[PDB]
Amino acid sequence: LTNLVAEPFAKLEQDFGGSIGVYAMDTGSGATVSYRAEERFPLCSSFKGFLAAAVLARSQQQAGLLDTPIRYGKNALVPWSPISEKYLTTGMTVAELSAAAVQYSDNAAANLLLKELGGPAGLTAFMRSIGDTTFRLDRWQLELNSAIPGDARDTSSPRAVTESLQKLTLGSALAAPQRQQFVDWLKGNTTGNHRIRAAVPADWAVGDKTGTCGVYGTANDYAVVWPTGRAPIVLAVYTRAPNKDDKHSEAVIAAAARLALEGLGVNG
Amino acid sequence: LTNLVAEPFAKLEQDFGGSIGVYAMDTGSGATVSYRAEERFPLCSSFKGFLAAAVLARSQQQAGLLDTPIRYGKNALVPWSPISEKYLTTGMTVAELSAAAVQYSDNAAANLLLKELGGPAGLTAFMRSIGDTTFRLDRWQLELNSAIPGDARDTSSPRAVTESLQKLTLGSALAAPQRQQFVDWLKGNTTGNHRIRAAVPADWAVGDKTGTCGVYGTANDYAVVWPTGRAPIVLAVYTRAPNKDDKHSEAVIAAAARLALEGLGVNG
Ligand SMILES: *C(=O)[C@@H](NC(=O)Cc1cccs1)[C@@H]1N=C(C(=O)O)C(=C)CS1
Ligand SMILES: *C(=O)[C@@H](NC(=O)Cc1cccs1)[C@@H]1N=C(C(=O)O)C(=C)CS1
Numbered sequence: 001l002t003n004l005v006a007e008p009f010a011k012l013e014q015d016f017g018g019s020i021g022v023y024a025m026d027t028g029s030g031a032t033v034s035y036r037a038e039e040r041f042p043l044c045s046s047f048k049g050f051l052a053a054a055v056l057a058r059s060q061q062q063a064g065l066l067d068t069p070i071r072y073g074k075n076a077l078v079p080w081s082p083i084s085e086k087y088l089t090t091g092m093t094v095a096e097l098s099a100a101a102v103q104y105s106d107n108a109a110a111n112l113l114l115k116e117l118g119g120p121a122g123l124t125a126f127m128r129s130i131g132d133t134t135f136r137l138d139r140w141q142l143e144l145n146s147a148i149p150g151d152a153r154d155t156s157s158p159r160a161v162t163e164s165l166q167k168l169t170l171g172s173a174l175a176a177p178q179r180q181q182f183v184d185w186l187k188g189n190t191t192g193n194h195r196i197r198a199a200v201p202a203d204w205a206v207g208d209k210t211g212t213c214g215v216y217g218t219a220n221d222y223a224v225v226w227p228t229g230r231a232p233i234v235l236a237v238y239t240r241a242p243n244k245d246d247k248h249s250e251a252v253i254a255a256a257a258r259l260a261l262e263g264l265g266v267n268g
Numbered sequence: 269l270t271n272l273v274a275e276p277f278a279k280l281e282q283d284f285g286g287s288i289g290v291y292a293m294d295t296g297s298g299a300t301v302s303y304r305a306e307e308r309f310p311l312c313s314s315f316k317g318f319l320a321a322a323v324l325a326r327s328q329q330q331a332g333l334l335d336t337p338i339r340y341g342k343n344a345l346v347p348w349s350p351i352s353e354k355y356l357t358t359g360m361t362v363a364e365l366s367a368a369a370v371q372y373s374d375n376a377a378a379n380l381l382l383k384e385l386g387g388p389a390g391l392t393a394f395m396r397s398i399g400d401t402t403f404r405l406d407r408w409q410l411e412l413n414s415a416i417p418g419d420a421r422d423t424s425s426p427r428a429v430t431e432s433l434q435k436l437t438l439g440s441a442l443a444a445p446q447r448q449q450f451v452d453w454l455k456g457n458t459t460g461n462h463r464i465r466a467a468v469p470a471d472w473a474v475g476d477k478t479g480t481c482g483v484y485g486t487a488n489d490y491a492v493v494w495p496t497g498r499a500p501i502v503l504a505v506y507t508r509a510p511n512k513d514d515k516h517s518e519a520v521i522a523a524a525a526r527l528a529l530e531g532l533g534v535n536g
Contacts, residue, residue: 149417150511242510243418 001031007259009035016252018217018241023158024260027170028231033263040134040155041238042147042218044211045105047123047137047154049222051113052098052185053168054126056178058117066095072112078142081108102185102209107141114140120154127164130173134160147218149242161222161236169207169224170232183207186224194250195221196237199257201268204228212248217241219248221257227266235260269299275527277303284520286485286509291426292528295438296499301531308402308423309506310415310486312479313373315391315405315422317490319381320366320453321436322394324446326385334363340380346410349376370453370477375409382408388422395432398441402428415486417510429490429504437475437492438500451475454492462518463489464505467525469536472496480516485509487516489525495534503528 013020021036059065071091077084083100084092085108092100097113100106117123120137127135138144138153145154167173169183186207200206200223208223222236237256239248261268281288289304327333339359345352351368352360353376360368365381368374385391388405395403406412406421413422435441437451454475468474468491476491490504505524507516529536 148512150513244416245418 001029002034003263004031005263005265007033007035007263009256009259012252012255012259016217016239016241016249018239018246020252020256021158021238022236022256022260023162024233024235024264025162025166026231026233026264026266027166031264033235033260034159037159038157040152040157041220041240042145042211042213042216043135043137043154043156044145044147044213044218044220045107045110046161046209046211046220046222047144048101048105048110049186049209050127050135050164050168051110051117051123052102053174053182054117054123055094055098055113056174056182057126060175060178066093066098068094070094070097070112072108076108076112078107078111081106084108084112099185099188103188103190105191105210105212111141120144130164130167132156132160132164135164145213145215147213147216147240149216149240158236158238161238162234165222165224165236166234170234183224192221192223195253196223196225196235196257198250198254199261199268200225201227215244217243217246217248219250219253221253223257225261230266233261233264233266269297270302271531272299273531273533275301275303275531277524277527280520280523280527284485284507284509284517286507286514288520288524289426289506290504290524290528291430292501292503292532293430293434294499294501294532294534295434299532301503301528302427305427306425308420308425309488309508310413310479310481310484311403311405311422311424312413312415312481312486312488313375313378314429314477314479314488314490315412316369316373316378317454317477318395318403318432318436319378319385319391320370321442321450322385322391323362323366323381324442324450325394328443328446334361334366336362338362338365338380340376344376344380346375346379349374352376352380367453367456371456371458373459373478373480379409388412398432398435400424400428400432403432413481413483415481415484415508417484417508426504426506429506430502433490433492433504434502438502451492460489460491463521464491464493464503464525466518466522467529467536468493469495483512485511485514485516487518487521489521491525493529498534501529501532501534 023037024033097109101110135156192208205226211220220238291305292301365377369378403424460476473494479488488506
């Protein structure tokens with residue numbers, strides 16, 4: 001049921017000047033679209049969705065975790081911390097930091113939560129616990145964005161990203177209240193309007209998390225999409241390019257998402 | 269007279285897993301072999317040959333320059349300074365530093381001479397003065413070895429390297445005594461036995477300068493070769509590869525030199 005209908009991913013990535021990786025699953029039938037789906041691509045900020053899921057998993061064994069206040073110093077603020085910088089003088093709860101990391105890609109919030117989980121190895125351990133053997137986080141922000149060609153640090157594959165997203169949003173990896181909170185955070189993301197969402201009709205529900213490394217044409221997005229009247233779709237689109245100064249493209253991510261939905265026979 | 273005889277450079281670079289750039293000139297007939305010859309490749313230590321030629325050019329207007337003693341501190345010693353480290357407590361002359369830079373690829377010696385010439389811009393100005401509009405040096409050692417894909421800093425092309433080498437060793441860019449000293453330094457190089465020299469019969473004279481960046485499979489060599497009974501050949505072989513951890517190959521440089529000589533119809 002993989003690639004029943006061929007789509008012109010190769011021409012798209014040639015126009016882009018780099019590499020595109022796509023996996024998409026129709027959770028009703030099991031049909032899939034797959035292009036470079038087992039290659040490694042840099043995660044960039046897309047690790048933050050899985051980080052919020054790990055926080056939610058911990059909250060199942062710590063009833064008070066999400067409402068715990070967290071105070072931090074100015075040394076915790078790194079570039080692109082649009083929400084956490086406004087609460088420097090007050091602190092924020094664990095849930096508020098998780099929402100900021102997911103919905104505004106707040107960099108400081110995600111570094112604070114990563115510390116709470118035991119660092120890059122602690123998030124990797126959570127991903128192993130749900131059966132993902134591909135994901136690896138190795139460094140902190142902003143260092144994890146280097147996107148060096150051939151470097152496996154801070155990478156995963158489109159397929160493993162999609163499979164783990166399905167387990168966390170639609171499967172049983174989280175208990176039902178935590179699962180719906182994860183979905184709600186993804187649905188409220190503000191940074192993805194020009195990526196997968198640009199290929200999705202306005203009357204369908206959709207949640208996503210973006211990543212943008214800033215070098216090597218490297219950017220990405222993953223999403224759960226609920227077309228009306230049929231089962232949800234889960235998909236991941238990752239990009240990279242050979243030269244450090246190559247620019248990323250939001251339009252290419254949107255176009256690859258359109259091809260994936262067309263390959264699954266979903267009318268849009 | 270370019271590429272009268274095709275050679276399998278593409279299969280060689282595919283076996284290597286990267287890109288190879290070759291220019292070779294028969295100075296008797298003007299026939300040339302050219303493959304990726306106008307692409308930019310990192311210079312790495314190959315800039316040091318041109319640096320020694322620039323020192324020689326200056327010596328034409330300063331009779332005492334070559335025998336001027338130079339004393340330096342331990343802070344001038346950078347990794348891979350095998351000759352200059354043995355004269356830390358005594359100093360070395362300008363000529364001795366030039367010989368060390370050319371023949372042992374001594375890193376500290378080349379940084380001291382670059383300072384004497386007014387830095388990377390001063391060496392670039394010398395190359396412009398002999399008609400080379402392609403060469404650029406931008407940084408000091410060891411920083412100039414980063415070999416980042418797409419970065420034009422500290423690069424030239426195989427063709428421009430060969431054309432400038434011809435002007436300096438066989439043409440009129442240097443006065444006759446300085447020209448022969450440059451040739452003698454190149455003939456005494458010790459670091460190139462597994463590169464162009466490995467394709468050259470033992471009974472032919474040959475001088476060369478190597479470069480090895482340490483990343484991105486990036487290494488190179490250029491040479492003047494005097495086959496007996498015919499005019500000299502000038503050639504340059506540069507390599508790079510897409511991933512930071514890709515290894516360079518001396519054997520590929522030797523093999524590309526063999527193809528270049530075969531393409532020119534020189535029996536070896
Ligand atoms: C995550 O990807 C993170 N990116 C960086 O911190 C590196 C850069 C900083 C400025 C430009 S690139 C944040 N996430 C997003 C995203 O979710 O796409 C960004 C747009 C940049 S900041
Ligand atoms: C020049 O290429 C210079 N290379 C470096 O300093 C970077 C590296 C250090 C250790 C391994 S690579 C010197 N030149 C040569 C050469 O002429 O080929 C080398 C073999 C390394 S040191």
